[PDB]
Every structure is written in structure tokens, then in C-alpha cells.
Amino acid sequence: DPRRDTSLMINERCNFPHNMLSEENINFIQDAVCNGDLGAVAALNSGLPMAPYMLEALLAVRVKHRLTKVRQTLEPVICYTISVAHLINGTRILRSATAKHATAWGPNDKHRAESGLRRIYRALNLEDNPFDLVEAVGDLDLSQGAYEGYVRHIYSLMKSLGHDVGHLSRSLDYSTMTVFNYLYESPLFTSQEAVTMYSRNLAGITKMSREPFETLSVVHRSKEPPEILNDMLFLLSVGRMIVLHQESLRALRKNLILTASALCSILYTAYTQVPETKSLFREVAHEAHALLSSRSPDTPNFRPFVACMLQFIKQIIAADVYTCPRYLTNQILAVTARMNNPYNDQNIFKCPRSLVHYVGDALFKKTMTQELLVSCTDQEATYQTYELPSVSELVGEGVAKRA
Amino acid sequence: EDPRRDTSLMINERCNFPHNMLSEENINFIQDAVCNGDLGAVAALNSGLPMAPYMLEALLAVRVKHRLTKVRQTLEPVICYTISVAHLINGTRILRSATAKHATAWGPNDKHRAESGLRRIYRALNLEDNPFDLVEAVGDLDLSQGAYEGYVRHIYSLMKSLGHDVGHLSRSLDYSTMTVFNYLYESPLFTSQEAVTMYSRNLAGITKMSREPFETLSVVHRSKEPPEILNDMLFLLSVGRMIVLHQESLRALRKNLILTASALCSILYTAYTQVPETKSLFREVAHEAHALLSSRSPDTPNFRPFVACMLQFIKQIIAADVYTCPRYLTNQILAVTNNPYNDQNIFKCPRSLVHYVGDALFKKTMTQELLVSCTDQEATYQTYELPSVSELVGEGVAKRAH
């Protein structure tokens, strides 16, 4: 069973979701990425639940040396594309996990837990309603406060029954619980059986197993405290992971929408170097603006922006020029502050073959700015924003040069 | 075995950092932080291997080890800036040495040997030209790109007029080794592999700081014959062109580094806000970025203090055990307006609050261009200032007190 064991699954598409990319674009990305990095792409593509800042920190994907010239534009495009695959797949994970969590226990399984818990409260002379805890375990509308309360409640019952939670947990290795889920934080399960079974549930979440969650009270048909209390710790701790997963994916969606504006901006610099890509760059811009201004209550759909970015970057690759957005922007800035003109350099600028429809007022316009640290005190660093409207003239001048 | 002139990669005890740039603790911090598979590329880029600044930028693909994943998006730009400064310092030294080797490749007697062999060529061709002018020009750096291409073409036509089919000869030669140590050199068509071999050792010796003078065929074989002298002239001319381009590259690199210090300071500000007890170290980083951009002095910019400050700062960021993701953080701050400073993987609360958290927060206004509309002819961006993180950071401080 590859979907619940400790194995790393990778399908035919490098774990890209189906119906997000063309076969060609899937092949393009696989061929462009360093071979040593393909496993990390497949893992991040999988939707492995994680915070958005962990995704960003783990996204250290290199292109092959032969793509060095476009590395500063192609790597951001690919990293965005992976983040989109992560979001699409992770959304399927979240929905599937939510269903598994809500249906792990049917009426008869809730009754078995609640009966066993009645037995516990009685033996301990406790006034608590066993129905309450069994309902909470099924409840995703649960504060971080109540969660840790219920967990602490379960720990006491365990200790009161003579279970050395401490000793038992210090002898167990929980590392397996988070191999496929970076948002999950494991309670102190008190048996290796439990750890092993719940680790298979967590693996199955990420690897899209179709089986329901295994729980010990169901598997053994047992009302006994060891089975039902660990089971409740599992179900509560999955509910908390799910709440955090939902919030991570919302924050990832917002990041991708904002980053869409930033990527369009650095892809503009590359468009100015290869102005025959105008119609391709226009689509990159319209799809970025569509994401940022979308009104749909529907989720944002990043597939058209990604497709546009990749069809653009393939023509940039064909131009055989160095795309260095920061360098180019810094050179434009230096020149403007008045050979310096980067567009006079063949390694930078690829002159279009017909000029009427590509440069001059036919140049797609985006305002270029750069901010600079212009004063510093012991309390503030002042930045000044510089506008570089001069781009069209410099490009004009590099066209002229080639004549 | 002459390592300074063959095709071997020299790497000193400092990963090719120049001396008197970085403390020893900082050199060791960087060697230990970088993925081992990338140390070779760090040493090669540190060496100053002549290249255009855009080539340095495209090649700066340097990964930190996995144990530093949390700070990767701040530490890597810092390491990459530091390598680019090593590259400027060392390449500035290469340029000065290459300039001296080019200006002195031929002494008086060697100039006489070439002018004599050249007068023979001119006599046998019934040409009026002064052999002195061409020999003077191969030792002159004050040549337009125009006069250069013209002297090459003159040599090329002497070669055909002597029966030398320049095309047949040069097409089958291997010029690979000419550029292994110099990405600015643009080879002429040489006439023999013997020429290419010796000229490749000259170019190797430039980047690897051989103290030998250039080898030329006319000098080594004490020959006046046209192959020797005409191939030598092509070489001295073409290395003269590389030096001119190399000086232009270092000027452009110096200016990128000064402007980029302003971007690095903006990246590192996001991390200061996550770890506000770093205020006095961050303030130094910013003061040093400001000095670089605002210095009136004539003497060259000196990046060593900015680097040391960035490195001292990032060490404290590593210690705080938080994820530094400047674009994520800025997007989240832009989005509000969930608070990233409430997340303990993001924000490290200081112990003394009066000196760090509220109005004691060092201020840098965060500014962001945003795409707001587009047409078939444009993508409209407008610029927006972000609220102060003071209230957001403040909010994070409350949440960790109760």
C-alpha cells in the first residue's frame, strides 16, 4: 500500500495535478530543472501540508546550467508554478482530510467511545458528560483553547488510570507523524501501535488514500481506555491540523495573487529585452490583472496565468539573452540619472525583425520604478522612489545601434 | 606543473576570498553555510574571473545547507552580495596586473623584432604603411572599438596576401581554452593551434595571477616570420580589448553593488522587524548602505564594512529560529490592510520592550508597486506605502505576553 506507508510517491507528471498544465509544459519544467532537485519539486507539488512561509523557504529550485542566462526569470516562473500545483493539490487534500475526519466514526463508533468513556468517568467518580468529549472530537469549530483543554483532559484521565504518559511517550518516536504533514503536531500517544496506525492515517491524507482513518476502538472493536483515549487524541489533533491547513491555503492564495503582480513586473524587464514577445507578454499582464481584480466568490484559478508565463518564457529562452531584472533596472537607473545603455549590448537586447509594431509607441508600457536608501538616522531610513520612464528611448537607442 | 597558467582550478585556503576583506570567523561562517556542491562555484566566482556583471548575476546560484532553510531568503542574498564584493576586489587586482602585462609584453627589442618582420611583409607587398604604427597600436589601450577592428582586419588581409587562407586555418582550431578563465575575451581568428595554446596560458595567467609576462611566439622562438608576429599582434590587440571591456565591467559592477545595497537593506529590514532586538545591528547595516550611496569621496567605494555588518546581523537572525521570507511577510502585511507577527515561527519577541517594540522600532517605510489595470497596450502600476508594522508588531508582542 504505497498510499499509507512511509514511501515517497511520484506519478507520471512529477506530482503536478491533472488538468493544470499541458503535457508540453510539464515536460519543459522537468527538463529545465536540475536533476538533483526533481524530487523536491515532486514533494512540494504534492500539496504536503505546510505553512506558506515553509513553502517559500523550501523553494530552492535550480535550473540546469544551460539555462543560466534566464535563471533570474525562469526560476521565479517555475517556483510560482510549483506553488500553484501545491495549492491545487493541497486543496484536494484538505477537502479529503475534512471528510475523513468527519466520518472516521459513525453512530456506532461514537456510541462505543462514549460507552467506554462512561466506564472511565464512573470509575474515577467524575461528573463529566461523556457525550461532550466524543462530540468535540468530531468538531472542527474548536478554539486552540478548547483543543488543548480536551487534550489535557485526556492526559489526566490517562494518568488517573495508571498510565505513565511520560515514560510511555519518552520511549516512542513521533517523527513518523510529520513526514507528510508539516502542520501536524503530535500528542503524546502512548503506544507504538497507535503511532504507527495514526502515522498511516496522516500519510494517507497527503497521499490521497481512499481508505477511511483507522482508529483503535474501531479496529479492535474495543471500549477500553487505551484505544479510545488515543483515538480521541488523534481525532482532535487532526482537527487542529485541518484548521491550520485551511488557513495556510488561504494565505497561500493571497500570496500567489500578490506575487502575480510582482512576477509580471520582472517579466516586463525581459519583455523589453525581446520586444517581439509583446503579444505574449500582454497575455501575462492581463491574466495577472484578472487574478488581482477577480470578483468571483469562486476560488482564484491560476492555470491561465501559469500557461501564459511559460509560453512567454520559452520565447525569452529562444532569444539567447541574459535576463537579470535587478541588474537591468539598476543600469537603466544609473543611465537615467545623467557604454552604459544595457540595450546597446547584444547579450542583453534582441532586436526585433520588424520595428513598426514592436518598439516606440508600439512598445507595451509598464511604469518602472526603483526605490533607494537616500538618508539614514538612528531612528529612520528614508527611501526615495525613482521613476524610469526613459525605457522606451533607451530601447530605441539599442535598436538604432544595430543599423 | 605551473598551476597559474594551465587549465586547473586554483582554490586557496580562503575559498578564493581576497585577503583583508572578511574576518576569519566570517570566511568560516560562509564556507560552512553553503551547500558543499556549490563551494567550487563560490571559489570560482570569488576569484574575479573576468565577466560582465550580468554574467555574475546569472551565475550566482548559491544554495545554503538544509539546516539554514529558515533564513534562506535573507542569508542567500547576503552571501551572494559578499561573493560579488570578493569578485570586484579580486577582479580589480586582475585588471591592474593584466594592464601591466599588456603594456610590457614587448620590450624595445621585441618591438623592433616585430617592426622588422613587418617591414619585410610590407616590402614584399609593395605597401606604403609604416610598420611602426601597427606595432605601437598593439601596446595601446586607447583604441576605439573602431580602430581595433580595423587593425585586426589589416592583419587578416596581410595574412591572405601571404597566401594564408585565414578561414580554412581558423575554422578547425579549438578556441575553447581561451575563455575558460575569461568570459570577456573575444578571440580573433588565429592561424595555428600553437598560437591558441600559448595565448590560452596567457589568459589563464591573467585570472590566476601568474607573475610571468605574456608569452608571445615572436619572443619565445625569436622569430620575425609572419605567422609568429601576426598572430602575436592579434593576441595583444584582442587582450587589449578585453582589458577595456573588463574595466567597463568593474565600473558597472561597482555601481550595481552600491544600488543593490539599498535592496539588500530592504530585504534585511523585514527580518529585523521579526527579531526587533537586532535594532542596533540593523541600524549599522542601514548606515553603511547609506554611506555607500551618498559618499562624496573620490576614492573607490569600499564594501567591506557593509558586508561585515550584514554578516553580524544575519548571525543574530539565524539564532532567533524564525522563517525569514521577505516577500511572504510583505504580502501578508499588505493583505491585512491574519497578522504574521502573531506566528511564533515568524516573530521573536524581545525581552525589553521599551527599547525595541513601539516607537523604539527603527523605521523604514515599506513601499510596494501594484498592478491595478491593464490594456492591450499597457500594464498600469501604482505605488502604495504600507501601514507601519509598528501596530502589527506591537500586536504580536501582546499575544506573547498573555
Side-chain angles (χ1 to χ4, degrees), chain A residues 1-401 403, chain B residues 2-402:
Chain A
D1 197 356
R3 276 182 201 273
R4 289 182 288 180
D5 60 26
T6 56
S7 73
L8 303 176
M9 274 184 75
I10 309 182
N11 60 22
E12 314 62 64
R13 312 185 290 261
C14 214
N15 287 345
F16 276 113
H18 79 244
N19 293 343
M20 158 212 182
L21 288 172
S22 70
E23 211 97 87
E24 181 188 327
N25 278 340
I26 285 163
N27 280 334
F28 167 75
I29 289 168
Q30 266 159 178
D31 289 331
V33 165
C34 268
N35 294 308
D37 285 351
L38 282 164
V41 169
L44 293 174
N45 270 356
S46 81
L48 203 162
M50 70 183 56
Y53 46 82
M54 324 169 174
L55 177 56
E56 280 273 292
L58 289 160
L59 267 171
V61 176
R62 327 159 257 136
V63 294
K64 293 175 177 170
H65 181 86
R66 58 162 173 100
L67 291 165
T68 282
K69 289 188 187 188
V70 300
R71 144 169 311 111
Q72 310 258 247
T73 58
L74 180 60
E75 295 186 336
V77 172
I78 291 185
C79 283
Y80 192 99
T81 300
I82 290 165
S83 299
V84 167
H86 183 95
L87 171 64
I88 292 168
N89 278 330
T91 293
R92 278 135 200 201
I93 290 162
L94 170 69
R95 167 177 311 126
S96 166
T98 297
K100 289 163 154 171
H101 173 261
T103 67
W105 279 354
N108 192 32
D109 311 304
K110 295 182 209 191
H111 166 69
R112 176 190 306 112
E114 142 190 53
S115 170
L117 191 57
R118 195 161 289 113
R119 286 184 198 161
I120 289 179
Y121 289 170
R122 193 160 313 268
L124 299 173
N125 283 103
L126 291 176
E127 296 295 314
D128 302 61
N129 196 334
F131 185 80
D132 288 327
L133 184 61
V134 167
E135 286 299 287
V137 135
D139 184 356
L140 287 176
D141 203 350
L142 218 62
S143 54
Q144 189 181 4
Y147 167 62
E148 307 176 351
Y150 284 121
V151 168
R152 276 195 314 263
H153 176 78
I154 285 146
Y155 287 154
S156 325
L157 300 169
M158 253 164 179
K159 287 183 262 173
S160 294
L161 299 165
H163 296 204
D164 192 340
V165 185
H167 198 199
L168 297 159
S169 48
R170 281 184 305 271
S171 47
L172 292 166
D173 189 353
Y174 300 110
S175 274
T176 179
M177 300 308 302
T178 60
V179 173
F180 303 99
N181 192 313
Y182 301 165
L183 296 173
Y184 177 87
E185 179 153 82
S186 177
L188 306 168
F189 300 113
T190 56
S191 77
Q192 177 72 73
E193 191 189 16
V195 172
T196 294
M197 171 190 290
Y198 304 157
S199 164
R200 277 157 79 240
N201 291 335
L202 267 291
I205 286 163
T206 294
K207 287 191 267 169
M208 279 327 254
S209 166
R210 264 161 191 271
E211 311 308 319
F213 289 164
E214 287 162 294
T215 56
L216 300 162
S217 59
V218 184
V219 169
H220 302 297
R221 319 200 83 151
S222 155
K223 324 196 165 162
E224 294 311 300
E227 288 75 34
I228 63 168
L229 295 175
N230 278 289
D231 283 351
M232 300 150 193
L233 290 172
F234 166 68
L235 291 166
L236 288 159
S237 64
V238 163
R240 171 79 181 143
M241 183 267 306
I242 279 165
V243 160
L244 258 52
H245 195 196
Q246 168 169 57
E247 181 52 50
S248 304
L249 293 189
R250 277 131 145 69
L252 175 57
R253 258 168 224 124
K254 291 177 262 131
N255 257 254
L256 290 174
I257 288 162
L258 297 183
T259 295
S261 169
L263 243 178
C264 171
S265 182
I266 76 167
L267 295 171
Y268 184 71
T269 72
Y271 151 77
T272 71
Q273 298 179 228
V274 187
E276 58 254 59
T277 61
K278 178 168 136 117
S279 86
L280 276 184
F281 182 72
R282 165 171 48 242
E283 292 307 304
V284 162
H286 286 241
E287 298 292 355
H289 176 250
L291 285 165
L292 292 138
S293 69
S294 159
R295 286 186 40 83
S296 303
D298 304 290
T299 169
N301 174 7
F302 298 93
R303 292 167 186 77
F305 182 53
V306 164
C308 282
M309 266 204 316
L310 293 166
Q311 264 42 251
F312 175 79
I313 206 69
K314 291 159 162 170
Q315 291 301 123
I316 295 306
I317 281 153
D320 192 26
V321 287
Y322 290 81
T323 65
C324 297
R326 146 154 316 135
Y327 166 82
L328 188 78
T329 296
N330 280 342
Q331 291 291 126
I332 293 164
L333 186 172
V335 183
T336 309
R338 61 199 155 187
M339 170 90 77
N340 323 277
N341 179 346
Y343 299 107
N344 292 330
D345 186 332
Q346 206 155 85
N347 285 333
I348 290 302
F349 182 63
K350 159 106 184 270
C351 195
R353 298 183 58 72
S354 66
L355 314 182
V356 183
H357 282 289
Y358 284 142
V359 301
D361 273 313
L363 185 95
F364 198 86
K365 302 292 201 277
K366 178 259 184 199
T367 306
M368 308 226 306
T369 62
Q370 179 64 274
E371 74 168 357
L372 279 187
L373 167 54
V374 285
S375 95
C376 189
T377 72
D378 264 43
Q379 308 114 282
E380 187 175 3
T382 306
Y383 278 62
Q384 179 173 358
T385 291
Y386 296 88
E387 307 175 348
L388 319 170
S390 36
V391 171
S392 203
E393 303 150 64
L394 293 160
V395 164
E397 164 175 322
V399 175
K401 165 138 182 200
Chain B
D2 186 19
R4 277 176 206 285
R5 282 186 290 182
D6 59 17
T7 55
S8 82
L9 307 176
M10 290 180 65
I11 298 177
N12 62 24
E13 83 202 349
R14 310 184 288 271
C15 207
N16 285 351
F17 281 113
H19 60 53
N20 291 340
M21 173 190 157
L22 279 179
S23 70
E24 205 200 337
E25 165 182 323
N26 276 340
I27 284 160
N28 285 340
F29 170 74
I30 290 171
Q31 294 171 163
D32 298 336
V34 166
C35 261
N36 231 56
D38 288 343
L39 289 171
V42 176
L45 289 189
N46 273 352
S47 78
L49 194 172
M51 66 168 73
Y54 47 81
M55 323 173 175
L56 176 60
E57 270 260 76
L59 295 168
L60 270 161
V62 187
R63 318 163 279 169
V64 296
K65 295 173 175 168
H66 182 240
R67 56 156 177 101
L68 292 158
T69 287
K70 284 192 193 183
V71 289
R72 164 178 98 71
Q73 300 193 318
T74 57
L75 171 57
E76 279 177 358
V78 167
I79 294 182
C80 282
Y81 196 100
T82 296
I83 295 168
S84 306
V85 168
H87 182 96
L88 177 64
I89 289 168
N90 275 333
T92 293
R93 277 144 208 210
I94 286 151
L95 173 64
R96 186 169 83 240
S97 175
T99 302
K101 294 167 167 176
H102 169 269
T104 69
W106 277 356
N109 192 50
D110 312 308
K111 293 223 251 255
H112 167 68
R113 183 187 303 110
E115 145 194 37
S116 176
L118 187 57
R119 207 184 46 221
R120 298 172 173 180
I121 292 172
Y122 285 165
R123 200 225 56 181
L125 293 200
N126 312 308
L127 305 180
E128 287 308 85
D129 308 61
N130 205 343
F132 178 80
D133 297 342
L134 181 58
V135 172
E136 282 296 285
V138 314
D140 189 22
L141 285 181
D142 283 322
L143 293 189
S144 55
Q145 193 180 345
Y148 167 70
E149 315 239 23
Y151 281 121
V152 183
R153 278 198 304 273
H154 179 64
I155 289 162
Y156 284 165
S157 50
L158 299 171
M159 282 183 165
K160 309 119 180 213
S161 300
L162 299 173
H164 276 273
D165 184 15
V166 197
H168 273 40
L169 293 154
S170 56
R171 71 167 90 270
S172 62
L173 294 184
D174 178 20
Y175 300 94
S176 300
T177 60
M178 291 301 272
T179 52
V180 301
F181 295 102
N182 196 307
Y183 304 163
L184 291 172
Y185 182 78
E186 148 77 65
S187 184
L189 318 156
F190 297 111
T191 249
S192 74
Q193 195 64 45
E194 189 197 15
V196 163
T197 296
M198 148 190 309
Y199 303 153
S200 307
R201 305 152 47 61
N202 289 345
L203 284 150
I206 282 157
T207 296
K208 289 188 276 184
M209 310 286 284
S210 179
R211 289 106 201 171
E212 305 292 299
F214 286 166
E215 301 165 81
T216 52
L217 292 167
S218 63
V219 169
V220 157
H221 309 299
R222 305 192 20 261
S223 160
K224 288 197 216 188
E225 292 325 301
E228 283 70 23
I229 60 165
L230 292 185
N231 279 288
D232 286 348
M233 282 177 209
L234 287 175
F235 166 76
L236 291 168
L237 285 164
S238 64
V239 72
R241 255 281 156 267
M242 179 267 299
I243 287 174
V244 173
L245 277 188
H246 188 201
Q247 158 171 228
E248 184 35 53
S249 290
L250 296 177
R251 299 162 192 282
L253 177 58
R254 277 186 199 84
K255 274 150 55 223
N256 191 32
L257 287 180
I258 290 163
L259 304 178
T260 294
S262 168
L264 249 179
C265 187
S266 179
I267 280 149
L268 293 177
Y269 184 70
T270 66
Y272 153 71
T273 71
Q274 297 178 231
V275 191
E277 64 242 65
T278 59
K279 179 173 150 147
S280 68
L281 289 167
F282 181 73
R283 172 195 289 130
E284 279 189 73
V285 168
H287 274 121
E288 294 295 357
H290 177 243
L292 287 173
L293 313 126
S294 72
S295 168
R296 290 170 171 259
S297 280
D299 37 359
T300 39
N302 171 11
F303 296 97
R304 293 169 180 78
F306 186 52
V307 163
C309 289
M310 282 198 295
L311 287 173
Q312 258 46 248
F313 174 70
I314 203 76
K315 284 153 169 177
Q316 290 312 118
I317 297 309
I318 292 167
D321 202 11
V322 294
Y323 291 78
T324 63
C325 294
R327 207 209 281 310
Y328 170 79
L329 193 72
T330 302
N331 285 342
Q332 290 301 93
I333 289 156
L334 197 151
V336 334
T337 323
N338 176 314
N339 167 13
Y341 297 103
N342 287 325
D343 189 328
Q344 297 201 330
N345 281 323
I346 293 292
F347 177 69
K348 158 97 167 61
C349 199
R351 298 297 64 201
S352 311
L353 307 182
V354 86
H355 181 30
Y356 297 128
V357 165
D359 291 341
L361 206 70
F362 189 91
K363 302 222 136 43
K364 180 239 166 201
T365 303
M366 271 188 198
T367 298
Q368 189 66 15
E369 70 174 350
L370 272 180
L371 171 60
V372 290
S373 71
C374 70
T375 69
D376 283 16
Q377 303 164 247
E378 71 219 283
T380 311
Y381 282 68
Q382 284 184 351
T383 296
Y384 295 98
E385 304 194 307
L386 294 197
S388 191
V389 309
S390 229
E391 203 253 318
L392 298 173
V393 162
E395 202 164 71
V397 171
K399 170 150 162 8
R400 253 149 304 283
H402 40 248

